[PDB]
Amino acid sequence: GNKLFNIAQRILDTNSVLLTERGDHIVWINNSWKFNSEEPLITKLILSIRHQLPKEYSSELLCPRKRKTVEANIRDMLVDSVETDTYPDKLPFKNGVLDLVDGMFYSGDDAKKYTCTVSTGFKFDDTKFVEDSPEMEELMNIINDIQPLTDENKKNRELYEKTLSSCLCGATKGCLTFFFGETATGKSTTKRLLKSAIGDLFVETGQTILTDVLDKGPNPFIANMHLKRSVFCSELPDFACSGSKKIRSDNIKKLTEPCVIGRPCFSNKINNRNHATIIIDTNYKPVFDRIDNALMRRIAVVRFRTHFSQPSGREAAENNDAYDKVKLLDEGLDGKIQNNRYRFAFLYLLVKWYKKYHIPIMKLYPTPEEIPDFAFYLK
Amino acid sequence: RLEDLVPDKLWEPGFISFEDAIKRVSKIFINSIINFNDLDENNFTTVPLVIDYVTPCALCKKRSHKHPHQLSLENGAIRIYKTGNPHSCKVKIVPLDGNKLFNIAQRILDTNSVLLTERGDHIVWINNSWKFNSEEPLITKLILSIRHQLPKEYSSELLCPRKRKTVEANIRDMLVDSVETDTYPDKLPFKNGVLDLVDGMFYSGDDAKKYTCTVSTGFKFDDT
């Protein structure tokens, strides 16, 4: 009978438009599950798909009135809600989703059944995903410089690799990792490398989430953690000073749960999904308000024992007791890092590490025997 | 079979109904066709049309014609030509594909004056400056300004405001991939061109357009 109704049926049954639990509509164009609350992209999808119809149906997809009618007819057919971001082992790029079970990369209709909302923000280029390359060699040299693979530093090396590789899967982490080390050691180097590797799925905020309550008033730092896969906590102030804020334990217990409670400004939605790995960049021994067995199983610490400096204070660096090896500082590193010269190389290294470690299941383990404050309670 | 012979027919699906197609032809001939009843979907390319000339012919502006006209179908358009001496009457073509304003939107987007920036705005190109705005879109202004660089048969439709709104709506539905801006860092954008720095030459007009500079100093460059 009707003609535009069949067009709407064809748009619907191909499973291109979906309805989310919050009441928004997600569409599928440019090989990405993009959505806009203010600009409906349904008309764009209709005009883009007009090419896959019989010649007698295309002519009706030119009048803006007819496209609006088709959109209105489509909107009255989505009755059941659909939940998104259910697959925890898929890394979504702008032009497709890269699988992690076998390393293959899908695109188009293949990378569509996995309803991925967030994305890294940049396209995926398979030609730079090779294993042998000068960028690979330079990055391997950098990684072996920051964490030497000696028998004295074997467990620390593999723990560092595991913590870095955990920042890909979208499951719920259950431990907090401290990047505890001295100044000018290479913590920011790893932070920048990870930020270039994963891009948009990486945020860094202040230390207030550790020394403040998370319920009174708004908390925009919590709403920024929705569906993020890695959170870095830098600029942690020293605590041996006067009246310095102490790391509240309750925040640590509340930051490792599948749902963190907190509302952004001018909003009411109080639930948030916690897919983020929390890494804390401190400088000295962290002190808490109270130590208990409930805090014993949510703490992991890695050690950085390689200082970088210019030949000015070379002897001072060589004589210091907190270091293990000192090398020459480089200036162009921060230049080519921001140009993403080690973008896909670090991504391939991370994928290899993830396939090596967490292929059966994902689980982070604590290590309580690395801080003397936690060695006191050995009684 | 016909698939290996030619992918062509006399009336493919997608074309308008034959009665509508003849109606468009009938409006071109301002006078009345005499033998209209001899036409159908199977002989309109052979039957000559004997027009009655009360008013001067709408095609050649002559008082009368010696011989009847005759239709012909090529590439999805009924060309109208006159038998006898071909140079006496000019050539008119009757399109039958689809919407006209859609063609206008396609050909305005073709000249690369409307772009979708990364942040989600709609930059335009008027008065040699990549000006843009969010609260007040300038797409209709761009249409009315660029109506000059289009064929004649498109100017008559870019005057009524509702047609311009329809063209704007069509344009907004074709921009699906975004383009980044401000790639060259050693250029100074002014209100009437872009000034280079490596050699001091001051470009303007189309030449100073590939440098997609969103911002501008706000004043004009006075070479004097």
């Binding site: - | 012909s72 090529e74 590439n75 999805g76 358009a77 060309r79 030509y81 071909p86 140079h87 000019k90 050539v91 073509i93 399109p95 594909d97 063609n103 396609q106 050909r107 987007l109 073709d110 000249t111 690369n112 660089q149 064929p151 048969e153 991939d177 189309d206 030449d207 357009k209 590939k210």
Partner: protein
């Protein structure tokens, strides 16, 4: 990006339509030959009745060809309207190719526009009933695979205009290992219609789309993706 790719002064021509593939690969003098610009003129002068079909010698070795189009309108057009028709034809064509070269080829839009509207070579048929020509853009270089991909958008443009010249664009020539009749020769021994040059271009070097000579004003663009991912 060696020396041999920034130049192609060898011309591959045919001698009869419908040459079988076996004769083409064997490259027998009886049907196909190699030529230079000067030698081509002598051959045409010595054979005022011969028929030649310009085509590409090898596909995968050299795909670099100029931009060319074909027009065949079966109706005479008076001089003033012919001039007006050719102005709209170039404006629409130059814009349409530039848009495609910018959206799926990663090239700059304004460089393509300037390089096309500046220097173009036009032919003219000797027939009086119909108006046909071969417009070859002199300073726009690309691969043949680009023209094959461009075939779709050109066809859409030809069916979506009112100008008689641009509506009669021959979009079927864009295929694999195409053939373009050289100016100054017939189509068959029985035909009497040939193409003639037009001012200001007098050299025959301006009418062969296989002649590649990248000068200071030429532009190059091609696809980044290949023809197998474009399903």
């Amino acid at each position: 990006m060696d020396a041999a790719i920034r130049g192609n002064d060898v011309i591959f021509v045919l001698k009869t339509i419908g040459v079988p593939s076996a004769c083409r690969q064997n490259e027998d003098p009886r049907f196909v030959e190699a030529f230079k610009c000067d030698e081509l003129e002598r051959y045409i002068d010595n054979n005022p009745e011969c028929t030649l079909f310009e085509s590409l010698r090898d596909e995968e070795a050299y795909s670099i060809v100029r931009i060319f189009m074909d027009v065949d309108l079966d109706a005479c057009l008076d001089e003033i309207d012919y001039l007006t028709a050719i102005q709209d034809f170039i404006i629409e064509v130059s814009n349409c190719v530039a848009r495609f070269a910018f959206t799926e080829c990663g090239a700059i839009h304004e460089n393509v526009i300037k390089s096309m509207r500046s220097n173009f070579s036009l032919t003219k048929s000797t027939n009086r009933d119909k108006t046909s020509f071969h417009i070859i853009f002199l300073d726009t270089y690309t691969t043949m695979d680009t023209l094959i991909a461009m075939k779709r958008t050109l066809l859409e443009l030809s069916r979506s205009s009112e100008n008689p010249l641009t509506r009669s664009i021959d979009t079927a020539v864009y295929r694999r290992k195409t053939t373009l009749r050289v100016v100054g020769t017939r189509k068959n021994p029985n035909c009497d219609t040939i193409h003639v040059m037009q001012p200001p271009h007098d050299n025959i070097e301006d009418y062969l789309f296989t002649y590649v000579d990248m000068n200071n004003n030429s532009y190059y663009f091609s696809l980044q993706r290949r023809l197998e991912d474009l399903v």
